[PDB]
Design a protein around this ligand. Sequence first.
Ligand SMILES: N#CCNC(=O)C1(NC(=O)c2ccc(Br)cc2N)CCCCC1
Length: 215
Amino acid sequence: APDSVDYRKKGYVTPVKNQGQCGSCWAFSSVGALEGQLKKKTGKLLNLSPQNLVDCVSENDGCGGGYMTNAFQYVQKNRGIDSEDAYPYVGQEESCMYNPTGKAAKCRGYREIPEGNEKALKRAVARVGPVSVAIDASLTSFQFYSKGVYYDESCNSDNLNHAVLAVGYGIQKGNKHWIIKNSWGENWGNKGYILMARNKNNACGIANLASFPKM
Ligand SMILES: N#CCNC(=O)C1(NC(=O)c2ccc(Br)cc2N)CCCCC1
């Protein structure tokens, strides 16, 4: 696999969004991984609908949390997901109001990266595109992140609490990293992104709950 890759440079990554006061990170994460595969398949990037996921993935808990794999299963079984413009984000859980007329992507299944296996995650990022991941984002250090390759010795890999998107990987100042898209707005972190330590004992649980969609 390459030493580094950044899918933002290849046009696979939409603008940084802002989930607000709803535990919909799983839906943003799932949507970002779908956005990536849409670009790869069609050449054309479009924002997809986290609200569609929040409302219609009956296997998840809406603003009370969810699994990304459950969302990909839904998109596949549903024969599509709507675009953001067709099913705009409202920041609360609702009845399912999916409209097939606003379909902008499909899903042909998904895969899961072997638990905790950072080389495997690296290989999936290289071969596929952006890959949905979950981390411990509870630490004030993570939340105040501004620059550099984030590492905190107190980060707990067994306490996943936040779903984000790995959009590449590499190195900075000799510190191996993952490039992570958050859903806390552009005002957060580095223009909405964080570089997180890679190959440092699976820091923050980065490779503990990773998956990507097929298209
Ligand atoms: N709120 C909130 C934000 N965090 C979540 O959404 C996560 N998952 C759950 O919390 C969860 C999963 C599946 C189901 Br169903 C219900 C759930 N609350 C995302 C994946 C990693 C664990 C944290």
